[PDB]
Design a protein around this nucleic acid. Structure first.
Length: 863
DNA sequence: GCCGTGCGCATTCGCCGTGT
DNA sequence: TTTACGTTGCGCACGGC
RNA sequence: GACACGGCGA
């Protein structure tokens, strides 16, 4: 059959008159009404895309995949698996010849059969009308075969799968491709003969229908999901069931709004929910984006006045569309040949259709999927600024993720990519003045990518290009030099402001938002908390006449070691017995440091080889991780570019390099590395399930991790292991299932997830608190009211940048000067469960010699 | 008690969309 | 209804002469 | 507390 969805009544969201007078008088009916029209639209747009997506999935037999099918699919699956099992019993206890189907349904697991039956037939019915029990049965029988055949090369003697065939499967997409690919793997698993040598004996269409038939029957027997329409004959979906998916899908499409900016200041936050938008719609905003309610309730009665003042001041910043920039963006994006790098192609590419051509395809392919993806987004951010082009000002509601970071709620907001940032500017401008001008030029220098050199040099760079800049402002569609800069629209956006000053002088009212970005917040904060004077200089926390480059500092240290090895290290080998590689059974050319240190130097190791690795350090990236980055980022790309033969055995080459980067960075920034290991031990111990080694009883259960940021924001890290069992099918994807063991309730913490998350999560929560403090500081001590916020990037209008430049450094300083985050963290969990004698807990790492006051005179820290 | 096998894991969080 | 190159060790867990 | 594939922000 077909699922009939119906639209929702969003008119309800059109707030009452008493709450409406809250807006009117405040902002006036025109807007007050417009806003509510806007919020109502958000919900309609959301419903629009759900219905669309749905209809798409339906016309592809993927109904079972939709979140509307799930609630029902999960009620049936058990009833089916049970019937299948019961059946297998009757058929056994009954003397004589067993049904022709029994034998085949024995290959795959019962639960697999049940899902493939629910799913496959669930499609056939909603797709076409060939809902004939003979056609459906063949569909089921065919799917059951392929799962059985290509399933063994996974469940049966086949780990080679989770190695040489698992990841390569996730690449191919579509029931069709994955099959044409397994037929392939299958054929070559013979040259080696994994499953021994039992070549899958085809099934023969006859039986492949006795099976499909049995299943249908079992399905009908266990649950009236489908009904056999009396008549060759056909089947159709049970009404109560069809009307069910329609109901879930209806509700689902009303809690999926496509949030937009506000036309009036957003609604102040006074609680954990309800702030931001004014209507009291279906999806009320939550101050915090917690996973699974309950956590959001923890914030219910927490006293954190400063956190509130911040989220409010922040979303109270008025913005407007940048028309001049919108003017060029609208058109230059319709060009066949755009001067701006990687700004989609209105039209799709093509490939040269005549080892060789293999890539001539894989290339254009990848390249297009990615482009079609950027296009969808660009067009939306575009066909949306045009909608707010004329408004006097717009606003964006804010809330935070669970660590405290502040995210704007609307889909189109100031924290997007370059084209989005360029289209937006601040509404409340002010006469630029002598300094706003100074900073404006620096903002412009940074937009051109010239940011790795001192301030006078950045000013010179801009002064030097006066005429280029003047030209781009006069005729952006003609000159286009701005389009070749690192952030073209933001740069262009600065060109129009820079020209304004020329034409009008310093009394000129400017509102362009000048960004002050920190360099590696993670490392800046660890170094700052541990007083690391060496890692702190590397990230500009200390005054210098030169701008420090942590990546350059690391690459440099790599060559220091690259020399010491090229002529003073290991030599080749041919593999021995249980040496360093645990215990392999053969022998190759295990290259030695001197061999490796040779190829790298014979390559030219610069900052770009280390860039990637230092960036992800704060996300827990270690030596193994680097092996992946260097290989993918540096080698492969160079090997494929044909211009790199230093490497013969690249995997060995990367292990070494990855080892070197780890070493040096491990001495460059110790506070970071050190504070990270500490954080991980603490997490490791609280998540541990302590059982007495004697009685085997649990003395202390696994624990979650909690802490409060310096501005009073509490954070609870409690990753949890999957509730239900995850079963993955070869082609028909995965599906959950209730726990086989009743004595498996609770919830269960995920100790591994607690360890790999704590360090980055802790640091992020610190960055956030820093941002929040900075905002409140700036607003109270200096009176600034407009803020562009991107986690570790703070911005204002030129006339206000000197005071933000100040504020951002005074808060970093005041905060770390007023409290020890690590020792504070300890004092939180030490007592409150952790007991027994788990005291293998390392001592807080030692503080260094960094004098935080210096950060005040530091010019390149920004944050 | 203390290792040969054996195996689980590699980078965090927030978001949006899906050629035939 | 045809593109998907690339595969290495270190740790925390059982049982066991 | 969600497949995979692609894109973006820190």
């Amino acid at each position: 059959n077909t699922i009939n969805i119906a639209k929702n009544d969003f008119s309800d969201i059109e707030l009452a008159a008493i709450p409406f007078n809250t807006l009117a008088d405040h902002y006036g009916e025109r807007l007050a009404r417009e806003q509510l029209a806007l919020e109502h639209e958000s919900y309609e747009m959301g419903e629009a895309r759900f219905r669309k997506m749905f209809e798409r999935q339906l016309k592809a037999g993927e109904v079972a995949d939709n979140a509307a099918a799930k609630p029902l699919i999960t009620t049936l699956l058990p009833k089916m698996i049970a019937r299948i099992n019961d059946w297998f019993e009757e058929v056994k206890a009954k003397r004589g010849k067993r049904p022709t189907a029994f034998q085949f349904l024995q290959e795959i697991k019962p639960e697999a059969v049940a899902y493939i039956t629910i799913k496959t037939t669930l499609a056939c019915l909603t797709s076409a009308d060939n809902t004939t029990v003979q056609a459906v049965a063949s569909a089921i029988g065919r799917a059951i075969e392929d799962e059985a055949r290509f399933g063994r090369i996974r469940d049966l003697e086949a780990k080679h799968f989770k190695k040489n065939v698992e990841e390569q499967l996730n690449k191919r997409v579509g029931h069709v491709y994955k099959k044409a690919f397994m037929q392939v793997v299958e054929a070559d698993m013979l040259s080696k003969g994994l499953l021994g040598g039992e070549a899958w004996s085809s099934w023969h269409k006859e039986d492949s229908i006795h099976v499909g038939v049995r299943c249908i029957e079992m399905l009908i027997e266990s649950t009236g999901m489908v009904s056999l329409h009396r008549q060759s004959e056909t089947i159709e979906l049970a009404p109560e069931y069809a009307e069910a998916i329609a109901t879930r899908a209806g509700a689902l499409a009303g809690i999926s709004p496509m949030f937009q900016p506000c036309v009036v200041p957003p609604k102040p936050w006074t609680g954990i929910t309800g702030g931001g938008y004014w209507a009291n719609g279906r999806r009320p905003l939550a101050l915090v984006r917690t996973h699974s309610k309950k956590a959001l309730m923890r914030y219910e009665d927490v006293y954190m006045p400063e956190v509130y003042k911040a989220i409010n001041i922040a979303q109270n910043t008025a913005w407007k569309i940048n028309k001049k920039v919108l003017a060029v963006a609208n058109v230059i994006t319709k060009w066949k040949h755009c001067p701006v790098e990687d700004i989609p192609a209105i039209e799709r590419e093509e490939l040269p259709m005549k080892t060789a051509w293999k890539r001539a395809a894989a290339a254009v392919y990848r390249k297009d999927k990615a482009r079609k993806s950027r296009r969808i987004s660009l067009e939306f951010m575009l066909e949306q600024a045009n909608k707010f082009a004329n408004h006097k000002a717009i606003w964006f509601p804010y809330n935070m993720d669970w660590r405290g970071r502040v995210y704007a709620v609307s889909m189109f907001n100031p924290q997007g990519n370059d084209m989005t940032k360029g289209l937006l500017t601040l509404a409340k401008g002010k006469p630029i003045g002598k300094e706003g001008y100074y900073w404006l030029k620096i903002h412009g220098a940074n937009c051109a990518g010239v940011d790795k050199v001192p301030f006078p040099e950045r000013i010179k760079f801009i002064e030097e290009n006066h005429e280029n800049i003047m030209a781009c402002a006069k005729s952006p569609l003609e000159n286009t030099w701005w389009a070749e800069q690192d952030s073209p629209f933001c740069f262009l956006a600065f060109c129009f402001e820079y020209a304004g000053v020329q034409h009008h002088g310093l009394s000129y009212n400017c509102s362009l938002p000048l960004a002050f970005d920190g360099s590696c917040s993670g490392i800046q904060h660890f170094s700052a908390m541990l007083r690391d004077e060496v890692g702190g200089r590397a990230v500009n926390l200390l005054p210098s006449e030169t701008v420090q480059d942590i990546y350059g500092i690391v690459a440099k240290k790599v060559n220091e070691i690259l020399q010491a090895d090229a002529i003073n290290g290991t030599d080749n080998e041919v593999v021995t017995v249980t040496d360093e590689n645990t215990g392999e059974i053969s022998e190759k050319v295990k290259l030695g440091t001197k061999a490796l240190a040779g190829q790298w130097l014979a390559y030219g190791v610069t900052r770009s080889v280390t860039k990637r690795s230092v960036m992800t350090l704060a996300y827990g990236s270690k030596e193994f991780g680097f092996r992946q980055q260097v290989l993918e980022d540096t080698i492969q790309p160079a090997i494929d570019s044909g211009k790199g033969l230093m490497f013969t055995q690249p995997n060995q080459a990367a292990g070494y390099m990855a080892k070197l980067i780890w070493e040096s960075v491990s001495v460059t920034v110790v506070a970071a590395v050190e504070a990270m290991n500490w954080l991980k031990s603490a997490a490791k111990l609280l998540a541990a399930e302590v059982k007495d080694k004697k009685t085997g009883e649990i003395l202390r259960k696994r624990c979650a991790v909690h802490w409060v940021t310096p501005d009073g924001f509490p954070v609870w890290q409690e990753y949890k292991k999957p509730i239900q069992t995850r079963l993955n099918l070869m082609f028909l994807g995965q599906f959950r299932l209730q726990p086989t063991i009743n004595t498996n309730k609770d919830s269960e913490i995920d100790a591994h997830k607690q360890e790999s998350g704590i360090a980055p999560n802790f640091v992020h929560s610190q960055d956030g608190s820093h941002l929040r403090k900075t905002v409140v500081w700036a607003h109270e001590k200096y009176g600034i009211e407009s803020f562009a916020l991107i986690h570790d990037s703070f911005g204002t209008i030129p006339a206000d940048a000197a005071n933000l430049f100040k504020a951002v450094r005074e808060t970093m300083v005041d905060t770390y000067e007023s409290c020890d985050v690590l020792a504070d963290f300890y004092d939180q969990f030490a007592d409150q469960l952790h007991e027994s004698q788990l005291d293998k807990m390392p001592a807080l790492p030692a503080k260094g010699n960094l004098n935080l006051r210096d950060i005040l005179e530091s010019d390149f820290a920004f944050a």
